Design a binder for these strands. Structure first.
Ligand SMILES: [Mg+2]
Ligand SMILES: [Mg+2]
Ligand SMILES: [Mg+2]
Ligand SMILES: [Mg+2]
Ligand SMILES: [Mg+2]
Ligand SMILES: [Mg+2]
Ligand SMILES: [Mg+2]
Ligand SMILES: [Mg+2]
Ligand SMILES: [Mg+2]
Ligand SMILES: [Mg+2]
Ligand SMILES: [Mg+2]
Ligand SMILES: [Mg+2]
Ligand SMILES: [Mg+2]
Ligand SMILES: [Mg+2]
Ligand SMILES: [Mg+2]
Ligand SMILES: [Mg+2]
Ligand SMILES: [Mg+2]
Ligand SMILES: [Mg+2]
Ligand SMILES: [Mg+2]
Ligand SMILES: [Mg+2]
Ligand SMILES: [Mg+2]
Ligand SMILES: [Mg+2]
Ligand SMILES: [Mg+2]
Ligand SMILES: [Mg+2]
Ligand SMILES: [Mg+2]
Ligand SMILES: [Mg+2]
Ligand SMILES: [Mg+2]
Ligand SMILES: [Mg+2]
Ligand SMILES: [Mg+2]
Ligand SMILES: [Mg+2]
Ligand SMILES: [Mg+2]
Ligand SMILES: [Mg+2]
Ligand SMILES: [Mg+2]
Ligand SMILES: [Mg+2]
Ligand SMILES: [Mg+2]
Ligand SMILES: [Mg+2]
Ligand SMILES: [Mg+2]
Ligand SMILES: [Mg+2]
Ligand SMILES: [Mg+2]
Ligand SMILES: [Mg+2]
Ligand SMILES: [Mg+2]
Lengths: 156, 208, 225
RNA sequence: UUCUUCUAA
RNA sequence: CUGCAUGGCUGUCGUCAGCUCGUGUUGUGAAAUGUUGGGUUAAGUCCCGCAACGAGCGCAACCCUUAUCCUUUGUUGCCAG
RNA sequence: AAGGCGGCCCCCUGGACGAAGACUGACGCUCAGGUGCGAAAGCGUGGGGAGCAAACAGGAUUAGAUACCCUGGUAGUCCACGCCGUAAACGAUGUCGACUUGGAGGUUGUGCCCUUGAGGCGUGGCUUCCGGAGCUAACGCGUUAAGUCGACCGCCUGGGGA
RNA sequence: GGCGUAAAGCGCACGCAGGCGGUUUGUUAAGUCAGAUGUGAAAUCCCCGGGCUCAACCUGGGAACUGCAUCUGAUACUGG
């Protein structure tokens, strides 16, 4: 029931006395089609072993996102280390308008109507951190009502 | 050429010889040719049979060939049909009266010659070599081997740069002399070349 | 359940000097006498009694409790308190990943049982006597580390810590697993990783016996209910 | 005490 | 003919004490930790310490030979009585 | 203010800071162009010239040695007055103001406690080291910010070519 | 968007023009804000329609033309 997407696989290296040792890294993100989103980053000597370590860590450390109907709730920004990221709630049925690694994380997030733009470095590890950081501090009309101590209707 | 052959180093300790007979120097090398020709013939003839270890023994100028196989049904056929066919051609080759005994191989996933030939048969019909090495290791550790190491070598998937790969699960102590390392080796004659397969299987330590 | 002059006689208000204190402990320090901070016992009592209520809440539904202190002065006291209310203790060094990497330590819990089975119960004398001492010092080492949790089987449900910075590894493993944390948070410690913060001294042997007996009561009182 | 340099894929 | 398409086999660094993995943790990451430190050893040998806990390949032992004794069997070997 | 400043004494002289008051009443901040200052080396004129020392000479060293090493040695270094206006002129961090957890110091005032000792309790200036949040590509920075903001200025736009 | 180390803080400072400016009251209405009027050609673009067998195209009505001027206000902020 948790849909699983790998974003990018990558071969890294490590030089020792014998020569170059190669290894593989895998960046996967999971989600339930609702606010539960979580990503993972695994690494092993082999590509099917690396995605499995990535899927394992992604299933725990999930994060909860207060969605709207099928879209976001207010235009929120998220940064991580190279990637200031803008994303925006959008009208019904405009699709996921998002780039690369950001497309995979919002699709398992269960949103369906976004207007996104990834500024800065578009390295897939940091931009998937920047959207999760961007989606986590997005707050609901309920959350701002309990915080400010008003009703939802006084906020409109 | 770093590693000693694990069968040949254990032959006085935990492994038996595949030929246990005696002759003087006058009649030695003729027997060793005679042992070679029947292992040549039976391997070509019982290729579809999953034969592992052909043990040859000759008392009183009469050869006794003990065939180890995973299924004796294809070796026998009808009751005295193919064994009797194979017994009369051994006597033509050995020049002495022959006798064929069949010792059944319980658990064929825990026998190195059967496992190496299973990898070779899979590689010959063009399967992914890494998938073949996983299933050879998973079946043996499930069936109860204390440790298996398999290894293929050279021209894998038709790549022009030949390399070797090996998997290992469980402990395979090669330097331990009392270790029951079942070792044997096969060769796959693919369309891109020859792929050599080695497989070590550790059953446990004989405490003699 | 513990009055203020109980705390005042044992030495709960004592702490460490003014060159070791954490600025996060500002709502808990009363003053500073003889270049040593003084813990505000006005806020110690209603928070420690709020913590013992949750112990009575969690041990009601048969939760597992782990006592964590390896100060090598309060090592025997944290063992005797855990054997009163027959709960679990860590008196020698908290292994890195004892909670998060439980599935590897589990493979040493089983080893601890088999070494206790083979030598004591199995009576496996007359082996190679240097290995017979290697079996002995293996079982001695594993009991010294994992003997306090050898009957626990699963993750505990609440964690009681003697020092919030000396046992900071156990705080982080509990923070990952969502397990609530009970700790004597002194002035030189960090009060953020502890879910129910209890101010108080850490080096006072009288206070250690004072802290644990109030816990060893409310577990036994919580067990029968 | 002095103690330089090494192309090809 | 091509060892620069290969299998097999071999030299070599080097009988040098190293080389790695699982899970955990640290780092955005390449990676790190483990494997470092205090001692000690022929040895990642062992002990203690330690965010590591474990495991594997090796380092050792199991093998052969030699060095003393015992029992058994004494010819084609032996000669004290 | 920066460059920079080191025996001692006098004369002339700038700035900072502190303690209490008194007073003026926004008089402030920044600054293109402009002007001034600005290490050493160098230049001009006039002195001075112990030591040091480019250049140069000799000796070694070396395959060579226009070098390092040695023995010498001239501008120069010093003073007066001009000029040059540059340095890795660096904290590689423009100035001014506000706010934001701490620790160990150095230095320099000043209040208080019986100075019952060089102590005890404070309160200002300047400064060094470590470090939290936060920030940062990381290294690190971290109340003297590279944190959170405001005002103004200078500057950047691939590496060469330059 | 940047400028410790990747390109990037003038060597430092004074300072004219310029930019900016604590706090309180009054006044002004310049900025600002609101309304109205005049204008912002038509076409084009957009919206709702209509017409060519549909579409391209043609076309009716509207919105828009984010501007400027004048007048009537508003006085928190900025200016005087
Ligand atoms: Mg870029
Ligand atoms: Mg060899
Ligand atoms: Mg040359
Ligand atoms: Mg070769
Ligand atoms: Mg070869
Ligand atoms: Mg050759
Ligand atoms: Mg070629
Ligand atoms: Mg690891
Ligand atoms: Mg991580
Ligand atoms: Mg190593
Ligand atoms: Mg390492
Ligand atoms: Mg050591
Ligand atoms: Mg070892
Ligand atoms: Mg006045
Ligand atoms: Mg100025
Ligand atoms: Mg000069
Ligand atoms: Mg000249
Ligand atoms: Mg001159
Ligand atoms: Mg002169
Ligand atoms: Mg002279
Ligand atoms: Mg000289
Ligand atoms: Mg310059
Ligand atoms: Mg300087
Ligand atoms: Mg300096
Ligand atoms: Mg500069
Ligand atoms: Mg610092
Ligand atoms: Mg910033
Ligand atoms: Mg700043
Ligand atoms: Mg910066
Ligand atoms: Mg840029
Ligand atoms: Mg540079
Ligand atoms: Mg630069
Ligand atoms: Mg500067
Ligand atoms: Mg200027
Ligand atoms: Mg004003
Ligand atoms: Mg006004
Ligand atoms: Mg006006
Ligand atoms: Mg108007
Ligand atoms: Mg129509
Ligand atoms: Mg028009
Ligand atoms: Mg005004």
């Amino acid at each position: 029931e948790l849909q699983e997407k790998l974003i990018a696989v990558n071969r890294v290296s490590k030089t020792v006395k014998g020569g170059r040792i190669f290894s593989f890294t895998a960046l996967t993100v999971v989600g339930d089609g609702n606010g539960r989103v979580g990503f993972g980053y695994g690494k092993a000597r082999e590509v099917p072993a690396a995605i499995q370590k990535a899927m394992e860590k992604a299933r725990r450390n999930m994060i909860n996102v207060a969605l709207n109907n099928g879209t976001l709730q207010h235009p929120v920004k998220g940064v991580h280390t190279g990637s200031r990221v803008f994303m925006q709630p959008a009208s019904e049925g405009t699709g996921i308008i998002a780039g690369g690694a950001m497309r995979a994380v919002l699709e398992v997030a269960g949103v369906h109507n976004v207007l996104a733009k990834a500024y800065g470095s578009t390295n897939p590890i940091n931009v998937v951190r920047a959207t999760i950081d961007g989606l986590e501090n997005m707050n609901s009309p309920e959350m701002v009502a309990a915080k400010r101590g008003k009703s939802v209707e006084e906020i409109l | 050429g770093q590693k000693v052959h694990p069968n040949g180093i254990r032959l006085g300790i935990v492994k038996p010889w595949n030929s246990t007979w005696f002759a003087n120097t006058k009649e030695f090398a003729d027997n060793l040719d005679s042992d070679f020709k029947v292992r040549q013939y039976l391997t070509k003839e019982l290729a579809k049979a999953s034969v592992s270890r052909i043990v040859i023994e000759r008392p009183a100028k009469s050869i006794r060939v003990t065939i180890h196989t995973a299924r004796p049904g294809i070796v026998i056929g009808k009751k005295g049909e193919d064994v009797e066919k194979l017994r009369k051609v051994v006597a033509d080759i050995a020049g002495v009266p022959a006798q064929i005994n069949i010792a059944e191989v319980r658990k064929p996933e825990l026998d190195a010659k059967l496992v190496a030939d299973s990898i070779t048969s899979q590689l010959e019909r063009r399967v992914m070599f890494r998938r073949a090495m996983k299933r050879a290791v998973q079946n043996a550790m499930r069936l109860g081997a204390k440790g298996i190491k398999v290894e293929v070598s050279g021209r894998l998937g038709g790549a022009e740069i030949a390399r070797t790969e090996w998997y290992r699960e469980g402990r395979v102590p090669l330097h331990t002399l009392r270790a029951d390392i079942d070792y044997n080796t096969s060769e796959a004659h693919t369309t891109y070349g020859v792929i050599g397969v080695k497989v070590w299987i550790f059953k446990g330590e004989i405490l003699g | 359940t513990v009055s203020m002059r109980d705390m005042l006689k044992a030495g709960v208000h004592f702490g460490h000097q003014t060159r070791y204190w954490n600025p996060k402990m500002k709502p808990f320090i009363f003053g500073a006498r003889n270049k040593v901070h003084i813990i505000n016992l006005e806020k110690t009592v209603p928070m420690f009694n709020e913590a013992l209520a949750e112990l009575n809440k969690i041990a009601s539904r048969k939760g597992k409790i782990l006592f964590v202190g390896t100060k090598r002065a309060a090592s025997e006291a944290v063992k005797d308190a855990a054997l009163s209310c027959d709960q679990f203790f860590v008196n020698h060094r908290w292994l890195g990943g004892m909670l998060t990497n439980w599935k590897t330590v589990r493979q040493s819990i089983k080893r601890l049982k088999d070494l206790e089975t083979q030598s004591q119960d199995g009576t496996f004398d007359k082996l190679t006597k240097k290995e017979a001492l290697m079996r002995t010092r293996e079982l001695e080492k594993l009991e010294n580390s994992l003997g306090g949790i050898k009957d626990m089987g699963g993750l505990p449900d609440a964690l009681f810590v003697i020092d919030a910075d000396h046992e900071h590894i156990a705080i982080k493993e509990a923070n990952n697993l969502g397990i609530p944390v009970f700790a004597i948070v002194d002035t030189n410690s960090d009060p953020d990783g502890v879910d129910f913060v209890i101010p108080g001294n850490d080096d006072a042997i009288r206070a250690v016996t004072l802290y644990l007996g109030a816990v060893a009561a409310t577990v036994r009182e919580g067990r029968s209910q």
